[PDB]
Design a protein around this nucleic acid. Structure first.
Ligand SMILES: [Mg+2]
Length: 792
RNA sequence: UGGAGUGUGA
């Protein structure tokens, strides 16, 4: 069947007005038609095909096209308002390479279907009409800019400037039409991406290396880095007077020119000298940025909400959609004002802390609170602990003092940290991590009469490198320990807030919890606390662009303690490259008969063992989907859940509520009045816990926008929750309030988070599991670690 | 790796 229809509109919270970045578009009625494109020989170059089509149009616009102006998608589809006076005619295009183009009328799209879908009278989205409108709107943007997909950004509009290590950053908008509740919306939003500067090869190499290589040949690592950076760069020769030929470069010779600047190897297309070549403008940097040039872009793309709103308004008026021939002929009419969306600021929930404290309750003012005069619900009275000093700057006395300070902070925050460790702290070196870990574990087990450790405070260096991952992998797949790796800078500079955050982390890293909603304690949460429910969360973390070697990791967590649900236990796996499903939610093989598996079954069994009873309802929070596979993901990951529940106990099919969360979109909400105190306590974003479900949401399906976090800088992007499946029959107010309330139960922070802790923990587990691989099956987690939040 | 929050809808 189709998705879950929207049951209604929310009412809770104080009314307020925000401004979205969606611009109303009025659909035309011109009987738009699509004409197929066939070019022989076949070339997969979108720019070349577009140029060929443009030349064909210029040649034969008044010949047999009837003065009708086509709109070409770029690869295979051509759209024209009305109907051309011909059906199947072929035109020859000579660029002098010659091409043969075949054009045939395919079918006629229906704008009335788009109107019916936007009016809420059906549930099927006319992808054809939406794509035709998008392409006819973006023809002029493609012509005037450099397309990178749905974003057309070019220089001389924001003065692109230096980024770091050669490549720079460009600025511009992101345009994508979308069918919303109020009608078609042009989702214009500012965007930026990295570009390679048109610099000579010598200058670019010097900037990337940050030094001079006039007389120093490159090392193996330097050569590998140069090849990785330069793989896929177009360069043009400049030594010739009037030969503007281009030579794509992917391989570099291993020998110098003599075997000018002939010492260094010359690029191979013969052997093109690297001293008389220039990088072609417009190239895009692949892979991912480094830690130094990511922040340089962050200082560019991170601007105030008012500045971003003004930039979007300026960009929309700069395109002038009311003047371009494509939209004038096609009947398009785009507005130039931000939608005045009404919102609702949901109230913050009451948090209950331990009775043994001055403050037994807390009301988060602006989405963040403090632990002063409060104690955790559950201390864990850690008794056995040890420390490893993987650093040389810090001394034994300094490390012992840091441990004592952390313990005192834990005790005053509500723990019972042991004053003295099992074994005296000793300093090792960051290369013998395995030997140090086995030595510490074996010594601790030899002492304390064969009782395992409960914690391991590790002071690893600032830029350790290949050390944190190895340490965590060994401790969580070969030893079975719990570690609290810290950095040397914070050990040297002790701050009470840092100690409190570390205490909050190590409380939940050893069982128990530190804060609970009063509604959860009082068994008063709508449609949750009435009967036991297990709240799941999934996330699939794909590797860095082209990384076939490394597989993709999927993680699934689930709440484990009922009456005050805060404790999530998760499992991880490794599946095929760039796979958008989770093949390990259920697995059946032959073993004498057919023993089952998967993560759903294991987590349900763990929940049953932990709380004494099987869960009665399920609330699934999926993440990491790309909007192109909702149907497939829902079908597979709901059939897997049903089969896992059936296999565990017969006739056990609890209701499920499949909700997909994703923050990767370009829907921004701005404060209606920037001169008023209705925004965050800073000079920035809108108030936390504000819900939007009108005028920018799906016309018929069930979704909402929730900005539950207090943005610290830049324009905070609210999360998007889409309820694909709903068997509990959640009301709009109930689901919005529940999702907002969970955001206040994050273990590691004393603030409200943007996405739900289920999905956030699933993402953290998936990101952490990348350190375990060293083949399709990941190493098995130890049995003393899977029951505790090792990832937090 | 104290933490939340800021850049890509494959
Ligand atoms: Mg994720």
């Amino acid at each position: 069947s189709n998705f879950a229809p929207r049951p209604g509109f929310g009412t809770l919270g104080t009314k307020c007005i925000v401004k979205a970045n969606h611009f109303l578009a009025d659909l035309p009625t011109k009987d738009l038609n699509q004409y197929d494109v066939t070019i022989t020989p076949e070339v997969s170059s979108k720019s070349v095909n577009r140029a060929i089509i443009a030349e064909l149009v210029r040649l034969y616009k008044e010949s047999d096209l009837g003065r009708r102006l086509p709109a070409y998608d770029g690869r295979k589809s051509l759209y024209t308002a009305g109907e051309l006076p011909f059906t199947w005619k072929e035109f020859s295009v000579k660029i002098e390479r010659s091409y043969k183009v075949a054009i045939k009328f395919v079918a006629r799209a229906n704008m009335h279907h788009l109107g019916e879908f936007l009016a809420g009278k059906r549930a099927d989205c006319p992808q054809e009409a939406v794509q035709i409108l998008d392409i006819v709107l973006r023809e002029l943007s493609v012509k005037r800019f450099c397309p990178v997909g749905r974003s057309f950004f070019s220089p001389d509009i924001k003065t692109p400037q230096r980024l770091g290590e050669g490549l720079e950053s460009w600025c511009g908008f992101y345009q994508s039409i979308r069918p919303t509740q109020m009608g078609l919306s042009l989702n214009i939003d500012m965007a930026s991406a990295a570009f390679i500067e048109p610099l000579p090869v010598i200058e670019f190499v010097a900037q990337l290396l940050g030094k001079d290589v006039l007389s120093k040949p490159l090392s193996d690592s330097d050569r590998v880095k140069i090849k990785k950076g330069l793989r896929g760069v177009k360069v043009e020769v400049t030594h010739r007077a009037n030969v503007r030929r281009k030579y794509r470069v992917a391989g570099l010779t291993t020998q110098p020119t003599r075997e000018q600047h002939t010492h260094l190897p010359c690029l191979q297309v013969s052997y093109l000298p690297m001293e008389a070549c220039k990088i072609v403008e417009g190239q895009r940097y692949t892979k991912r940025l480094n830690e130094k040039q990511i922040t340089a872009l962050l200082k560019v793309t991170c601007q105030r909400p008012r500045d971003r709103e003004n930039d979007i308004l300026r960009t929309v008026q700069h395109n002038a959609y009311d003047q371009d021939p494509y939209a004038k002929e096609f009947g398009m009419n785009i507005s130039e004002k931000l939608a005045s969306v009404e919102a609702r600021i949901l109230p913050a929930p009451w948090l209950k802390y331990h009775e043994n404290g001055k403050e037994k309750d807390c009301l988060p003012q602006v989405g963040q609170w403090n632990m002063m005069n409060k104690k955790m619900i559950n201390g864990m009275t850690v008794s056995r602990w040890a420390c490893v000093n993987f650093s040389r700057s810090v001394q034994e006395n300094v490390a012992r003092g840091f441990c004592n300070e952390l313990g005192q902070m834990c005790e005053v925050s509500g723990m019972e940290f042991n004053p003295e460790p099992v074994i005296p702290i000793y300093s090792a070196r960051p290369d013998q991590v395995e030997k140090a870990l086995k030595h510490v574990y074996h010594t601790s087990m030899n002492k304390t009469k064969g009782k395992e450790l409960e914690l391991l405070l590790a002071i690893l260096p600032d830029n350790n490198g290949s050390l944190y991952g190895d340490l965590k992998r060994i401790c969580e797949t070969e030893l079975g320990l719990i570690s609290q790796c810290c950095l040397t800078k914070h050990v040297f500079k002790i701050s009470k807030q840092y100690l409190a955050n570390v205490s909050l982390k190590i409380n939940v890293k050893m069982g128990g919890r530190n804060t609970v909603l009063v509604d959860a304690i009082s068994c008063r949460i709508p449609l949750v606390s009435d009967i036991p429910t297990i709240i799941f969360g999934a996330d699939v973390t794909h590797p860095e662009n082209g990384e076939e070697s490394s597989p993709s990791i999927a993680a699934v967590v689930a709440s484990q303690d009922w009456p005050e649900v805060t404790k999530y236990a998760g499992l991880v796996c490794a599946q095929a490259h760039r796979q958008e499903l989770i093949q390990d939610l259920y697995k059946t093989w032959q073993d004498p008969g057919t023993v089952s598996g998967g993560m759903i079954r294991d987590l349900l069994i763990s929940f049953r063992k932990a709380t004494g009873q099987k869960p009665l309802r399920i609330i699934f929070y999926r993440a990491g989907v790309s909007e192109g596979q909702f149907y497939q993901v829902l079908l597979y990951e709901l059939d897997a859940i049903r089969k896992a529940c059936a296999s565990l106990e017969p006739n056990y099919q609890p209701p499920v509520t499949f909700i997909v969360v994703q923050k990767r979109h370009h829907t921004r909400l701005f404060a209606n009045n920037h001169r008023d105190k209705n925004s965050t306590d800073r000079s920035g974003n809108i108030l936390p816990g504000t819900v939007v479900d009108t005028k920018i949401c799906h016309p018929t399906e069930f979704d909402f926008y929730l900005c539950s976090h207090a943005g610290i800088q830049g324009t905070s992007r609210p999360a998007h929750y889409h309820v694909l499946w709903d068997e509990n029959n959640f009301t709009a107010d109930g689901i919005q309030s529940l999702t907002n309330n969970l955001c206040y139960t994050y273990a590691r922070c004393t603030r409200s988070v943007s996405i739900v802790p289920p999905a956030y923990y699933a993402h953290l587990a998936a990101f952490r599991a990348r350190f375990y691989l060293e083949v399709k099956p990941l190493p098995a987690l130890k049995e003393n670690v899977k029951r505790v939040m090792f990832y937090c």
